[PDB]
Structures are given as C-alpha cells and as structure tokens.
C-alpha cells in the first residue's frame, strides 16, 4: 500500500504495470532461446499488456525474471504510453506531447547530483559475487533473433564509465552480447565522448583495465535519460535528479570506484580492454532487419564481479518492426532535443515527433504558419536553414528525413502525417538533398550500400507546406468526418448514431 | 439465385444478407448529413448507408446509397463490396479480384442484348420534357464549400457518335446547375473534336445526345471507372465479365442504349458552346480547394425515366479510405499489372495504396526476373517510368515505387516499412520532369506547375542494390516473419494459457 514512484522504482514500474492490468505473469516455462523474444514480439506488435517471464529455461532462484516491452505501447483507454509516462512519474493518459513538453520543463528544474546511501539500504547489495563465481554462460539470458550473434544480455540495461579524474561520468544504452563465461563484447565507446573516457585511462596506461559497470533495473527516470541525446556537458544523473526532483541514490561499486544505482537488480563489474576485441552483432535492429555480413570486431569486457537483488529481473528490449522501444524512447528522445534544438534557433517550431511507422527516420516539424509567414523566405530557403541546423548536431544523426508540415496537421497521429507527406509535396522537387552531412551508419538503405563505407549524405528536408501558407492564410476543407463537417453536425451524428441503426 | 454484378438491387441484397447494409428510416438532409454520415461510415470500415428518408424526396426520387464500395471488417471479408461488384466470393481478396479482372480481359467479349421495355425496371416511370424540374431531387450537398449539389458521384455517362461507332461509358463528376441542367467534364480532351465534328456534321453542334444512368448493374459501374485501353467497348468488356450480355434499352429522346435494370436514366444533350462554372468538388486528395470553379459545358436533361422506389448511390471523396481508392486507385492499379505483363516487365503485383491517396503504385518485383535483366537501378527505374507515364495508366500516379518480392503490397504495414528503409531519399528517386501531371494533384495544383502540367512526378527504388544480383537473405524482425512457423504457432496455441486474453 506504499505511495509507488515508478520513475525511482523498477518495482514500483512493474507494480503500477500490475494495477494497471498492463503486466501478464508468465509462470510457464519459457526458453530464453527465441521463446522469449516471440513472445514480446507478438506483445509489441498488437500493443498489449508486457509480460513478465517469471519461470526461464535454465534459471536460477534469483537469476533471473525478464520483463519484456519496458515502453512498449498499449491499448488507448489505459493511455497508450503509459509505460513511457511511467518512466517519468507522469499520468499513465499522458499524451506523447505532453511527455516530451514535460521533459523540456524539466530542463529547467534544479539538477540534483547522485546521493550515497548505506550499502545496508540497497537492494543491488543484497548477493554479491566475487569473480571466481562469475559465469556468465550460465544465466537464462535470452537469444532475441533469428541469426542474431549471439545471446543479447544488454538491450535495457545502462553502462558507466567515468574518468580518473572522476570529472565526468557517462550512463548509455549500447547493446551487449555475452561472448563466453566471463566476457561480453558491445559498442559502448563508438560514440567519441565515451571514446575518450577509455582514452583518459590509456593516458594512465590502463588502456587495457579500464573500469566500467553495467546495471539492469535501474530507475526508469535513468534507463530514459540515457536513451536521451542531451548536449555536450549537461550531466545524465543531475538531469534525472531534475527530473526526479530527488537525487539518484548510488552505492560504490564492489570492485572499482563508479557509483550504481543502489535500486539496480543487478550490477556486473569490471574492465574493458582497447586491444582485446571480439567480433559483435548481427542484432536484430530498430530498422525491422537482422542483416547477415561478416562482423565487425569491438572491445572487449571483463566481467570480474556481480551482485544482485533477491528475484532479480532483467528488462528486455528487443527491437524490430515498429513499435518497440527504439521507436517509443530513441525515436520520441530525438524529436524531444529537435523541439529544444528549434526553440534555441528560433525557428517557428510548434512540435516535433518521430513517427514510429517510419522506424525512427523520419522527423516531422510542426511549423507555426504565423511566425514562417513572418520570417517572408521561400521553401528553398526555409529547408536549407533547417537542415543545416540539424544534420549537423548529434540530435540528427539517426534522422534521414526532415519533413515540414503546417500547423494544422496533428504530427502525432500517422493518419494525418502521411495524408500531409503525399498530397503537400511535389516528389524530388520539394525535397533537398544533404550530401555532405553524417549518414547513419544503421540505417538500411545505408548499410546495404556503397555509403556504409562513404558514410555521407543520403538525408534531405522534405518541404510538405503548401507555397501559399508561406505567405499568406490558405482557407482549404480537410474531407473527412471530424475535421469537414459542422461541429454541431457532427454531434448531432454522433449522437443519433445508434438511433439511425448502428452498432 | 442473387446476382449481385448484374443487378444493383441484388447487390444491396447481399449486403443486407452479409450485415453490411443499415436502412435509415430518420429522416436525414441532403444538405451536409447524407455527406457526414458516409464520412463516418468509410472511416471506421462500417456497414454502408442506405438513406430511406431524406427530407425532400418523393415517394419514388429518391432513396441513396452511400459507400457502394467502401471498407468493411476483415472478418466479413473487408473488400466484399468490391468483389459483390464483380460477382467474387465476399472474403475475395483484392490480389484476386485484380487478377479476376485481368483474367476476363482474355474471354470472349459479349456485346449487350436489347430487351422489351415491359421487362425493364428502368422504364417503369417516365418523365418527359414538361415534368423534368431537377431542384425537386433531394440531391446531396456532400462538402463544406461544395460548388453545387453534386447529383452524379456514382453513375455512368453514356456518349455515341452518329455513326454508333465509337461508344463511351465514363464517370466524370456532375453537378446539378438549375431546374434542367447539370454540368461535368464528360468528354477528355481527346475524344473533344471527334465528338464535336461528327455530331455537328449532321447540323447537331450543340446538341449532342447524352445519357447518365445510375444505379447500373454493379459490374458496368466498375468497368466504367476503370481507365481500359482506347478502342475496347465498356459494355462488351462487361459482358465478357458477367458471362452474360448485358440487357439494354432505348433511350425516350435519342437512341443511347441503356442498362434495363437502371435505377434511374436521365437524357438529354449536351452543347458545348454553353458553358456554366463547375466545382469546386470533395476530392479523391482529401480537400476542396475553395472557389476553385472551372467551365464545363452544360447538359441539358429532356427526359428521365425510374423504378419504383428509386435508389440513387452516392460516392463522397475525401481521406482515405472511399471508392475513389478502392476502385480507381485499384483499377489503375489493375491496367499497371497487365502493362507490365505486355511489356514483359518482372512485376507480381500491382497496387495504390489506399492511404497515399491513390498517389502512389508500389509494384512488387520478381527478384528472380528482374535478376535475369542483369540491370541497374537507374536503368530499371528509367525503363519502367518511360512505359508507365507515357500512357494514360499513369496519369494519376506521381509516385511508383518499386520493392522486392518479400513485400505483400496490399498491406500497408508492409508498404511503408519497406518505403522509408529501403530506399536513400532522393538519391533512389529518378525525377520524370516532362510527362503530364495530374491536374488534381494538389501539390500540383496549389504550386506554378497548374500552368505547365509537366513533370513532379518519380520512380522510387526501394530495392537493395543487391537484389538486383542475388536474392540475399536477412531476418525481418516481427512475429510473424521473424520466427519458424513451429514457433509463431506454439505461441499464438499458448497465449491464452500464459494469461493474455
């Protein structure tokens, strides 16, 4: 009967799940080999209730549960991104917008540094092992794809790193897959500020000792925010502070300086190796494909310790076909910087959004006709000023295509983007390519082609604003229900619905 | 037994019959709700409306259809309303009322046959000239910022030279004018001097016989919505369809053959130096475009004749997804295929997808063929966009995508995944600069291209590069692809046992 706080609480997010009737106990037998990752996908893909795998093939007592679909969407009427406000503290009916708004504000609230708590008040102190008792291989951990590389351990779970100096610290989400009993492989430190992280430890010479953690169900508020491309030289835990409006509460590792959340389920310790590698992947992906080639080789990490709650549970993402979590938290986490991005520049942005049946690639900017029409430019003009502003900025880097549309369509619901997308712009001619921005190097069309190993360009602004509404009112009737008929005609339809004979 | 392609009150039977039909017996208006009540309907995929109480309306003129070929619930077959048109299964899905069509294109032909005006439900009323007072129709007002009451959104015009040579059977919007006339842009600007000239050579300039009939046996509508090749006949075409000639009468006032089981004929003529504006109309686009009124030429009405009881069916354009999507979008689509089977292009599969708004045609590429070709992508994407925007089947289309044989494209799921991943935005796109634009279009028609209708159009390829040489193999990463069939079924028999509903 506790006062629950799912943004702090990994359990008290899967206890609001529970309430919510939003969580189905499997205590069937299920095998983490493809069982699992079927199972969540079936879950993902008619938006319904995320189930917990409390009885895995092969685990033990405490190792482990899987929560599956952590910001999977579900049905309308319990609010259909529920999971999302949960990791926020927010309603269950917040709406998408309302998250992202919410998350600017919190920009603005007072960032709070992590707290130090008593070991004796911390769950993830519960069991501890020392290396000697580290196997990796004999933990349920799920095989999500078919042709994946190997078993995925690290989908929703979140990485420190931190320097000597302790003046930076670093939560992110890089994927990881265990390669033997005691080591997993993963691309923790392609991303140039986790890179020189591991540099400032080379500089020491331990180039090939360098300490990291990783840490499964943590507080949903931090698993969010390092999903999130914050500037340069904001700090992840002082954000999530904010947003907590409390500090993170952290305990030391066993084996190594770094502070982890102390409501972790799970911690696993040690130090990753700049010139020991592995080949990674492939990973099923948040394209929708599991593409076979020949590997490409990524540092190495040494698991040397653990520790755990009692009952621990891993959350799982297994990414794919809309709509998953690299669709709900990296897509939405993008288009929450883009609006920032817009207002810092003041270009005349009302929303941004990242719709998830275009697997994260498409940006849709909401345009503010009254501030374009004041800025009195042209389309040419307008789509180069945005795209410069984003396809240089790491926000821009998993966009290929910008798309700007009127106030007047609701970027948040496809119906209206794509009816907007094919009847407001003219092909190729209303769409101006970047040929010297970052490619993403995940993108399909990308790494199927000779720009995997150019990596530039193939990304452009999509203009789908009519000529007239920059310049001017433009007075048209959308033709359908809602939007084309008298309001009180609509009503009086609505109202008599049933009367006229339908269901 | 029913027959529902041949005979439009059969066809409302099977819809009563399949639960896919309401009968409104509140009185409704013409005015705006007719139009806002077929909205709702198409949106959510309901049973269509059929108004029995519009305010205004005689015993006789009229009753109205809504949604003749609209959406309804996949597990009453969610194209059966299309496939009625054709006399197919209800569950017939739309890959096999497309290759139904194209089939027939192979059967004997079989021209009409004329019947006795005793055995013709069309006959049973006639009005001649003193009675035609065409304001007294409880004609629907459909959009907001209409131009007019728009009284053919469903019918079939019928046009003939004197030489009874060349017959035409066509679907241009037609608005009510005043009291005895309606307008439209009936004929094309290729059949315009034709037409003119031989009528006029028989001192006949503006007087060109028409008839408009709705109501029409269900496979005539289709057909005459379908952009078939120039030189085929509609009706023999829609015989071949039927397996059975299609019953025809005489006209009242000239010698127009029409279908004996019309709901309604209205005849007249036409004159071409007489003009009125016409439109704006709710379009196939989503939109109308305000004050947007063109001339047309004026149809004078001189005679009708009905059944009793008669039922007017009415299509109201707009967002997805209407008969302008689901019958003009699929019977361009439909003419895609067998352009591609007679230019021996490597295509499955031909469609537009309704929620493009019949602006896009995703064709679905033997991987198998076009690997036989041993081409290129700008090779390929230039060889198919120079054969379909130089016919009058791409005239519609501004977009044509091309996509592996993995994809099924009548599910849009499918469609827009492949879309965005599977092509670099416009570096896999080939502009067509100089074909002809469609002029309903809109962002052709709101830009400077409504003057030159040339070009904005393109061939998008979302084919890897590599399945132009080998079919190579990767994972799509949903349930039902992405899991050995053992599996996706042992889930889908377990998921009520582990505790989902």
Redesign the interface.
């Known amino acids: 009967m506790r006062k629950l706080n799912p943004a702090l609480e990994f359990r008290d997010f899967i206890q609001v799940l529970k309430d919510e009737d939003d969580l189905?106990?499997?205590t069937?037998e299920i095998d983490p080999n493809?069982?699992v990752?079927?199972?969540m996908?079936?879950?993902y893909?008619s938006h319904?209730?995320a189930?917990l795998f409390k009885n895995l093939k092969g685990a033990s007592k405490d190792l482990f549960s899987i929560l599956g679909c952590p910001a999977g969407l579900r049905s309308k009427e319990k609010g259909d991104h529920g999971r999302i406000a949960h990791h926020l503290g927010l309603d269950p009916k917040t709406t998408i917008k309302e998250i992202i708004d919410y998350l600017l504000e919190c920009k603005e609230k007072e960032p709070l540094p992590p707290i130090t708590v008593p070991v004796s008040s911390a769950p993830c102190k519960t069991h501890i092992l020392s290396e000697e008792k580290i196997h990796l291989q004999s933990l349920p951990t799920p095989y999500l794809?078919?042709?994946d590389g190997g078993k995925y351990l690290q989908t929703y779970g979140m990485w420190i790193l931190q320097t000597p100096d302790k003046k930076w610290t670093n939560w992110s989400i890089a994927r990881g897959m265990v390669v033997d009993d005691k080591h997993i492989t993963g691309l923790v430190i392609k991303p140039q500020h986790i890179r020189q992280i591991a540099d400032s430890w080379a500089a020491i010479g331990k180039a090939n000792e360098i300490p990291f953690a990783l840490c499964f169900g943590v507080p949903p508020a931090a698993i969010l925010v390092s999903s999130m491309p914050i500037p340069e030289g904001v700090s992840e835990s002082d954000y999530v502070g904010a947003i907590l409006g409390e500090s993170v509460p952290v305990v030391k590792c066993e084996t190594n300086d770094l502070m982890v959340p102390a409501t972790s389920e799970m911690v696993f310790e040690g130090t990753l190796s700049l010139t020991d590698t592995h080949l990674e992947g492939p990973f099923?992906?948040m394209?929708?494909?599991?593409?076979?080639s020949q590997g490409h080789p990524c540092p190495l990490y040494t698991v040397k310790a653990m520790s755990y709650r009692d009952n621990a549970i891993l959350p799982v993402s297994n990414?794919?076909?809309?709509t998953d979590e690299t669709h709900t938290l990296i897509g939405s986490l993008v288009a929450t910087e883009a609006k920032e991005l817009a207002i810092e520049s003041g270009l005349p942005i009302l929303d941004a959004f990242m719709p998830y049946?275009?697997?994260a690639?498409?940006l849709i900017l909401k345009v503010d006709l009254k501030g374009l029409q004041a800025l009195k430019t042209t389309p040419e003009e307008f789509c180069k000023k945005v795209g410069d502003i984003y396809f240089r900025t790491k926000v821009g880097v998993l966009v290929?295509?910008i798309i700007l549309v009127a106030d007047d369509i609701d970027i948040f619901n496809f119906?209206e983007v794509?009816?907007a997308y094919?009847?407001?712009?003219?092909?190729?001619?209303?769409?101006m390519?970047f040929d010297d921005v970052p490619s993403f190097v995940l993108?399909?069309?990308?790494s199927?082609?000779?720009?995997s190993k150019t990596m530039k360009?193939?990304?452009?602004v999509?203009n789908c604003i009519?000529?007239?509404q920059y310049e001017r009112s433009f007075?048209?009737?959308?033709?359908?229900?809602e939007k084309?008929?008298?309001k009180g005609?609509?009503d009086?339809?609505?109202e008599?619905?049933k009367?006229?004979?339908?269901?």
């Open positions: 189905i106990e499997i069937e493809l069982e990752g079927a199972i996908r079936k879950a893909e319904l209730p189930p794809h078919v042709s099923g992906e394209h929708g494909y599991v593409f076979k990414p794919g076909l809309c049946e275009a697997q690639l498409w290929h295509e119906k794509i009816w094919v009847t407001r712009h003219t092909p190729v001619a209303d769409q390519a993108a399909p069309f990308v199927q082609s000779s720009r360009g193939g990304k452009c999509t009519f000529r007239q007075d048209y009737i959308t033709c359908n229900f084309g008929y008298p005609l609509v009086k339809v609505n008599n619905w009367r006229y004979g339908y269901k």
